[PDB]
């Protein structure tokens, strides 16, 4: 679950040469199917995303 | 010492506290607003591309 109400049953542990990396030379560890989010509204979810971004990219923590 | 009835009383005085009032009524001190998030200083891009 994230801390927005979103649950979700592990369907597959995909390899990390099959994950999609980033021009960062990163992949992700969790993929999310963006259609949780148009009959659910949770828009935090994506406030949350660039916020622990941003605080993992500067080194912050924020409210 | 007989103890008549007299009269009907004329009225009825009242004795009680009255409360203070030059403190209230002032203009009103609530509690101040927090700051908006405002964006730190010096934040630079650290991260620079591989190659």
Known sequence: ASRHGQKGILSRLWPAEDMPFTESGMVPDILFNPHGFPSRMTIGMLIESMAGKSAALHGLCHD | ?51
């Open chain 2, 1 to 51: 010492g007989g103890l008549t009835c007299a009269s009907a009383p004329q009225g009825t005085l009242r004795i009680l506290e009255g409360p203070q009032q030059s403190l209230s009524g002032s203009p009103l001190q609530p509690i101040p607003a927090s700051p908006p998030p405002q964006i730190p200083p010096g934040l630079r891009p650290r991260f620079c591309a591989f190659g």
